[PDB]
Design a protein around this nucleic acid. Structure first.
Ligand SMILES: Nc1ncnc2c1ncn2[C@@H]1O[C@H](COP(=O)(O)OP(=O)(O)O)[C@@H](O)[C@H]1O
Ligand SMILES: Nc1ncnc2c1ncn2[C@@H]1O[C@H](COP(=O)(O)OP(=O)(O)O)[C@@H](O)[C@H]1O
Ligand SMILES: Nc1ncnc2c1ncn2[C@@H]1O[C@H](COP(=O)(O)OP(=O)(O)O)[C@@H](O)[C@H]1O
Ligand code: ALF
Ligand code: ALF
Ligand code: ALF
Ligand SMILES: [Mg+2]
Ligand SMILES: [Mg+2]
Ligand SMILES: [Mg+2]
Ligand SMILES: [Zn+2]
Ligand SMILES: [Zn+2]
Ligand SMILES: [Zn+2]
Lengths: 343, 366, 367, 213, 214, 366
DNA sequence: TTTTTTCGATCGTATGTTGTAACTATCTC
DNA sequence: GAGATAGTTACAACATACGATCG
């Protein structure tokens, strides 16, 4: 299994094709670009048909097998594309894929698109069989740290002069949405033939389309950025996520912080992290939080979290978002009147 | 508007024009027939922006010129429900149309006729006349080979070609090809067009087995057919139909003369043995002998041995049961001829006597 | 007679549409340079010009003179498209027909060449209501579109569409029309219609529009009806007061400044319109909580509460936090004791009086 | 004995208690000729939404013409009073809220009115319509045929999508005052020849909140 | 067969109902004067006889002799209603028929004339358990139904019903029975049933009843 | 225990037994079916706690007496899968049952027979026998008026009344009533019972017009029907049924005699424009004159005029066309007699030839 | 090297599978 | 040339999957 990234796939395609291609990831833009590049190279090499299928319980595997076995009159070397479900293949789908790869032919070129497989899903007979003669491209959305580099590279590839302020604005507005950012770059290039982009020019034609996850909100709270946490919370509320997921995601981290603070009186932080198997990349951040919050805090937060949970799950109230915003401000170093805690 | 006709005369044209109309139309007016009385004749028009059917009926009673639209299903039901021999008198007043028959009276809503869409006039290029039997044979010979549903638009339709004094119909779906040709009797310029599936179905229903010749006109992007008092107009799907001659085998070195009935029985037995989907049936042909084995996944195989007239070297190849069965059924003769080159190559099938109809099947990899 | 003010003044040229400069400039440059995408998707709020811009683009994409950003408006194609009865322009209301069969037929119709136009444009409106199978069919048709077929999509909730369909089309997002542009458009329309007006009435109408030109035109028509063929400050103010439904913020503002008669007048006005008292009380609680959080951090107030941003920000700036906390506590107690009050209105009035001119005595841990 | 509520439904703009602003707006619109194609009525229960809607529909289709003071005696007025007019399509959205019903309703809106000059659709309990039903009406509301008018009545307008609210002129009815209710009750009892006392009328008006029904 | 005292002693006439004097007087006056309404809503605590009052009113409406406040109790209609097999009396357990489809089916049969009775009576028990859509569907027909149909509603939680329904019904509030009335009824029933008893036991039972006869 | 039988005889009784059994058994015992080999016959019984179906097949080949249970789905699949003419052998080996289905041996689980809830002792309150034709006629003529789903649970069935020497069937749903009666030549006590709609449908499907008579037994709480070698047992509603006599109008005076075919055609033609939701029509009756009117929401009107033999006063009455059409279809007579009293009263319908069957329709008041 | 949800009851839309009845076409009397 | 039987198509009923609202 040759593992690669979207930024280096072209050379491999220039080197030569293979029996099958795996496009696993989360970002849609990178997956679509890789699929288009692979299809273009295959068409240039002499591939004509472009059969596509979406994996579903109603899908008929007999037709796929017949296509893989039958031969066309005035065409050869057909290509097959599969769209896996978001959850991933199950045991029945695993057996179907095993049969399909058993019927795999050299002329047939197989492409699979979908989310990355978990530890259990990735370990399968069909996956192991394909690994011998497969190339997998990992398409993971870049994080906030790496986004400016990607934006600068894309702008340079398009022959555009992008300022630092413009790059920062584009990163802030379209964080987590590469497709929207690419379309915005295309629109900006179309608007200005000269290709010189300044801060006012980009500002006049940019909106908010950022996409976040609860983990980003929890990390923002831990670091202590009030504005970022509030923006993430507003974006998540507008998206329409379930508050219970946010509460459960925050509960584990809050309980871990409380336990460490209680046990940090007479124990080094490294020993506690090793005991709790805290991930290395987070360790420092965690420590920072453990230093910023006093012991009186992390008890009011727990009380407010419990009150919000009871309000949501008993009274079916609609004021959960306001309480979440209050708790977010509380986690950051702010006074808080303590009337809203209702302690 | 005002006219009066008989039930029997008006019963069949309504059924003919009500065919394409159905379901929920994109616009409400598309769901209504258009009736025009003029020049001592009544014209009924029904269209759906892709096909148009026009019927004409002669009037032998006093009337008045006019034009208006009326719902299709309700009018057809009213006409059908009335007793045999009843005389239908139709008139228009205000925004309503009154239909009277004996002591029965009905009022139906209508819409202005100025808003009814009509296909733009066009100049024909190739005009000719054919017997109904010729077109029936051509369509029936090369209809089942059309693609039921494919992204490639050209595969959905059928290729009608005029060359010299020959009319040819070609139908393919990427795995089968069917070509038929018949002599019209007059010379026409070379010209090929593609007709959609709906047009083919409409043409098939248009023929009634009578002796009336049908007149066909073909233009830049439209095809029109006159059959007695029925006029059918359709649009042509644009594209580039793949050439049929080149995909034919260049020089099959192996020939096989077989009995059509025996092959049909053997393939039926194999299908009963091979009802399980996936894979097909493997045939091994040797000198004056043939063996058939059902290679469905792991079901019991009962080999069928038959005697044929084969002179080439022995060879085995797999094929799809449905494709060969349909090809054999299309050729309704007693004996057939098959031409092939090797295991991996398209095989041609035709009748022992008539070479007008030919079929090409690509073997499935075993 | 007179048609409808909104329906009559639909823009028919790129110079008539007000605002949305970026979208218009991008479309004009793309048409001029020949860079035309295979699918467009217009998004935004209601009554901003999505359908109008789509129709203008369709008109300019099939003009007899040629592909241009300034269609003549006089040739046969332009006139027919204006009348909405052009042969090639196949406009489909996706909301009315969402089942797979209708979309299947419409997409199968693409196989035919255009009759009397260089392009055959499909204008699908309200695309978010299509079925899943309809989306699958549309994606299958849109993966490899013909060269003579273009798709125009208008939607208000783009997030409903699948990612696959979004990735295949260029998305243009429209913004709010702002107060000044709406006011100028209303002034121009009224001047063209020969109707008397006053600047303050137009300013009030623009403020009440809330970034929607269609709403502004509807309110202008209603005011003209109420004003007996003219627009006047008093008539528009009375109309807005009748339509005003923000009694919670007004009550909070009156209470915070220690006013009694104003609170009684607001309570009577709220009682005049059918309103649930508990809903009003919880709304006031939410407003006070938002003000407190804004005082804690200026970024608390999001973009959702843009209409009343200024007043809430001023209240947060001026009112000390302790008063906000006390008002929140007393109103919470009032909400708690509301169901046992003799009457909902009487309970609300009592709680307002307590928050206005009273102070509870806290238990104060004595031991 | 027909109940008082059904018997004493207003039949003219002079028989409606209160609601001065909406009546004045409708009268001015009908007199000046500036007639919209989508009206929405909001307010608390039993304040005269359906009553004024029916009065407006009768005024539009009156034989004498389009006037703010319908005769109340011509055939159209009589039929509308008896609730059997052919051009007044009254729909109970609460009973028919499925999308297919809306599709069927909209499929046959192009046809001209049978006898009246306008074909008025009066939908009641609009808030009960499904989301798909709401979406299906947007295009028709925006650009209906010249001979079609939509009248909508609901109790909680906040349940409707903002898109629909922007397409129609909104009128909000206010709860009636105690004095108005007392005067109406006194007039009705006098017309019915029933003994009454001021104290009883005062108590009934107090206990009626703001709904005259 | 044997039946418990609760169901066996259900009142069968307006003279067998204890208390609720105002409600009975109002019903009798309405029946006598001919002022018949099409929506009655009996509300109150439990075990006071809402269902019994509704059944007696329905029996009086559909009596062979005529619209009378004192049903005979012997004609075919009265005994048929008592047995519960009367065709034109539709008793709907709203606690088990909350779905909108059932209500829509019910409201589509209101346009047919009654089979044998002069009125088609719908007696909905525990109407507070219906869904919101059911209430909204009812509203239109309940506002102005045909002349041959009457609606009777019985509930113990009038707060659940939306104000729209309450605005178009005649509401009758049933008071809780006093201790003396309960004791009198208990002693009467025991004397009729030939059961020995003592005054103190009856007083204790009446006190413990908490105003509910059931 | 051990028995071998041909597939042809075994097939079809098994289908009938498995009929009542559904996909979801909800209990291990109810999923299986009870097979009992006794004397020289095999009895297969299947129940779902509501209805029991038992079939008996005489066996001539050697067999071992016994009684056990076998899964229904597995046995059905085994019997269906085998080719034509196969002979099936079954033997109970200990806990398991071995079936020699052709050349393939299958194993099935066996459960104790004592746990099968099937009736053992039967007591009949009444019992008789009659030809299948009478039962089929009565059920066909009375079922269409039976209710489907209503609050009044006693109206969701069919009332069978043995009165004197005749048998009567009554059905109603609160909007129309159907009554039929026929003699049987046997004296029976007065006895009325209610059969649920599902049991009625199953009994109707059971009949096939065979000459063999049908035996009917009615017990305290159950009804049993024996036809040929099949027995079907069902339970009773037990909810009392209103007497039909009071439903019928008393002293009807207005009488209309008309032709069945003419009335059917007129109603069918008028129903085209009738409102789809309600399907309401209006009838105006005058001296030898019947005017039928139908309207539509969009003001589409249909009118019909019929000549009949009427002598009463003028009348106007509304109706539901569907019920009238159903009554006319079920009547199957040359002449139709309609009896009515006023414009708000029920209307009775029968055939002038005989009064064996009667129907009542309640007018739609508007 | 990842991690991640309350439950019951009710309403609405779209697609797929199975069974029964009615209409049309073909064969034999 | 007409009537009866069998096969094909259309309509109604039942089951499964997905999305949304209120307590
Ligand atoms: N930019 C604009 N300039 C002028 N009128 C506008 C503009 N945007 C919207 N309108 C008004 O709104 C109506 C069209 O609504 P539209 O915005 O196309 O609907 P949507 O954008 O919700 O699809 C027209 O009557 C038009 O006058
Ligand atoms: N403005 C009014 N003038 C006179 N009567 C009114 C008025 N508003 C309501 N009513 C009375 O209320 C009763 C019901 O009104 P209704 O049509 O149900 O209004 P809504 O549709 O708002 O419920 C009628 O019997 C009517 O007499
Ligand atoms: N006013 C009353 N007089 C006599 N018995 C009563 C009275 N109210 C209730 N009961 C008894 O209570 C039993 C049940 O009453 P029920 O119909 O359930 O009233 P509710 O519907 O208010 O619960 C009846 O069998 C009856 O004997
Ligand atoms: F016209 Al809109 F949303 F109101 F597209
Ligand atoms: F009929 Al209403 F509020 F009860 F309009
Ligand atoms: F039957 Al009750 F309260 F118990 F009405
Ligand atoms: Mg629009
Ligand atoms: Mg109303
Ligand atoms: Mg009760
Ligand atoms: Zn032009
Ligand atoms: Zn009038
Ligand atoms: Zn009586």
């Amino acid at each position: 299994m040759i593992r690669l990234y979207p930024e280096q796939l072209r050379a491999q395609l220039n080197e030569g094709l293979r029996a099958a291609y795996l496009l696993l990831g989360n970002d849609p833009l990178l997956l679509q670009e890789s699929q288009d590049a692979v299809r273009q190279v295959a068409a240039a090499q002499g591939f004509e048909e472009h059969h596509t299928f979406s994996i579903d319980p109603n899908t008929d595997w007999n037709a796929i097998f017949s296509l893989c076995q039958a031969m066309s009159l005035f065409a050869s070397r057909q290509t097959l594309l599969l769209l896996l479900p978001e959850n991933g293949p199950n045991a029945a789908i695993n057996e179907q894929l095993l049969t399909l790869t058993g019927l795999l032919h050299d002329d047939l070129l197989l492409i699979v698109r979908g989310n990355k497989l978990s530890k259990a899903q990735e370990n399968a007979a069909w996956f192991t069989a394909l690994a011998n003669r497969s190339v997998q491209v990992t398409c993971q959305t870049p994080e906030q740290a790496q986004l400016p580099r990607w934006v600068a590279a894309r702008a340079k590839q398009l022959n555009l002069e992008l300022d630092d302020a413009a790059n920062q604005v584009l990163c802030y507005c379209y964080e987590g949405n590469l497709l929207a950012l690419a379309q915005a770059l295309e629109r900006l290039s179309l608007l200005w033939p000269d290709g010189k982009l300044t801060l006012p020019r980009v500002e006049q034609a940019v909106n908010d389309a950022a996409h976040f996850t609860p983990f980003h909100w929890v990390d923002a709270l831990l670091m202590g950025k009030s504005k970022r946490a509030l923006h993430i919370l507003q974006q998540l509320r507008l998206e329409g996520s379930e508050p219970v997921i946010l509460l459960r995601t925050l509960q584990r981290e809050l309980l871990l912080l409380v336990n460490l603070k209680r046990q940090s009186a007479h124990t080094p932080l490294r020993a506690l992290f090793d005991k709790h198997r805290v991930w290395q990349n987070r360790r420092g951040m965690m420590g920072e939080a453990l230093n910023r919050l006093s012991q009186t805090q992390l008890r009011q937060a727990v009380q407010l979290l419990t009150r919000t949970e009871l309000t949501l799950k008993q009274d079916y109230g609609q004021s959960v978002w306001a309480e979440l915003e209050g708790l977010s401000l509380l986690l950051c170093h702010k006074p808080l009147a303590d009337v809203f805690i209702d302690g | 508007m005002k006219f009066t006709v008989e039930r029997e005369h008006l019963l069949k044209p309504l059924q003919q024009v009500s065919g394409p109309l159905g379901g929920r139309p994109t616009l409400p007016i598309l769901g209504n027939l258009l009736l025009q009385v003029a020049d001592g004749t009544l014209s009924l028009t029904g269209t759906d922006l892709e096909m148009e059917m026009v019927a004409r009926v002669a009037l032998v009673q006093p009337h008045e010129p006019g034009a208006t639209t009326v719902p299709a299903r309700k009018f057809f039901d009213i006409c059908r429900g009335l007793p045999e021999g009843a005389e239908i008198a139709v008139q228009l007043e205000g925004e309503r149309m009154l239909v009277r028959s004996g002591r029965s009276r009905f009022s139906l809503s209508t819409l202005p006729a100025a808003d009814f869409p009509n296909l733009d006039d066009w100049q024909s290029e190739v005009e000719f006349t054919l017997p109904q039997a010729t077109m029936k044979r051509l369509i029936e010979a090369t209809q089942f080979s059309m693609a039921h549903q494919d992204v490639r638009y050209y595969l959905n339709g059928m290729l009608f070609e005029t060359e010299g004094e020959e009319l040819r119909t070609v139908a393919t779906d990427g795995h089968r090809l069917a070509v038929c040709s018949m002599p019209i009797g007059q010379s026409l310029p070379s010209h090929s067009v593609i007709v959609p599936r709906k047009g083919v179905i409409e043409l098939m229903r248009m023929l009634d087995g009578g002796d009336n010749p049908l007149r066909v006109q073909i233009g830049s992007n439209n095809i029109r057919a006159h059959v007695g008092d029925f006029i059918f107009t359709s649009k042509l799907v644009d594209g580039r139909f793949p050439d049929y001659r080149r995909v034919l085998p260049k020089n099959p070195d192996k020939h096989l003369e077989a009995g059509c009935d025996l092959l049909k029985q053997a393939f039926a037995r194999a299908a009963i043995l091979s009802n399980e989907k996936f894979r097909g049936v493997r045939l091994y042909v040797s000198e004056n002998q043939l063996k058939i084995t059902a290679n469905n996944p792991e079901q019991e195989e009962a080999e069928e041995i038959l005697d044929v007239t084969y002179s080439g070297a022995e060879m085995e190849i797999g094929f799809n049961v449905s494709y060969v069965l349909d090809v054999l059924n299309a050729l309704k003769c007693e004996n057939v001829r098959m031409m092939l080159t090797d295991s991996v190559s398209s095989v041609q099938i035709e009748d022992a006597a008539s070479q007008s109809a030919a079929y090409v099947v690509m073997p499935m990899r075993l | 007679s007179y048609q409808v003010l909104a329906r009559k003044w639909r823009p028919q040229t790129f110079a008539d549409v007000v605002g949305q400069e970026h979208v218009l400039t991008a479309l004009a440059n793309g048409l001029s340079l020949g860079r035309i995408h295979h699918a467009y998707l217009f998004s935004g709020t209601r009554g901003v010009g999505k359908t109008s811009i789509a129709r203008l683009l369709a008109k300019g994409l099939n003009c007899e003179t040629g592909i241009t950003a300034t269609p003549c408006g006089v040739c046969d194609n332009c006139r027919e498209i204006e009348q909405g009865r052009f042969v090639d322009l196949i406009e489909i209301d996706a909301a009315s027909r969402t089942k797979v069969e209708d979309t299947r037929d419409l997409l199968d119709n693409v196989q035919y060449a255009p009759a009397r136009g260089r392009f055959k444009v499909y204008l699908i409106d309200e695309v978010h209501m299509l079925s899943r199978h309809s989306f699958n069919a549309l994606l299958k048709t849109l993966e490899e579109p013909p060269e003579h077929v273009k798709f125009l999509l208008a939607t208000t909730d783009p997030q409903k569409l699948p990612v696959t369909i979004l990735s295949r089309c260029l998305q243009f997002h429209l913004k709010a029309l702002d107060v000044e542009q709406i006011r100028h458009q209303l002034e121009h329309i009224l001047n063209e219609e020969h109707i008397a007006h006053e600047p303050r009435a137009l300013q009030l109408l623009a403020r009440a529009a809330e970034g929607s030109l269609r709403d502004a035109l509807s309110l202008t028509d209603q005011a003209i009806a109420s004003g007996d063929g003219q627009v006047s400050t008093q008539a528009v103010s009375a109309m807005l007061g009748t339509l005003d439904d923000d009694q919670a913020l007004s009550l909070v503002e009156a209470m915070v400044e220690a006013n009694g008669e104003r609170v009684m007048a607001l309570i009577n006005e709220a009682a005049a319109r059918g309103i649930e008292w508990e809903a009003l009380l919880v709304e006031m609680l939410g407003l006070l909580h938002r003000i407190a959080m804004v005082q804690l951090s200026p970024a608390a107030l999001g973009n959702d509460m843009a209409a009343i941003e200024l007043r809430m920000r001023e209240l947060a700036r001026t009112i000390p936090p302790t008063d906000i906390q006390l008002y929140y506590q007393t109103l919470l107690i009032g909400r708690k004791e509301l169901p046992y009050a003799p009457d909902r209105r009487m309970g609300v009035e009592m709680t307002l009086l307590r928050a206005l001119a009273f102070h509870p005595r806290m238990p104060l841990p004595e031991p």
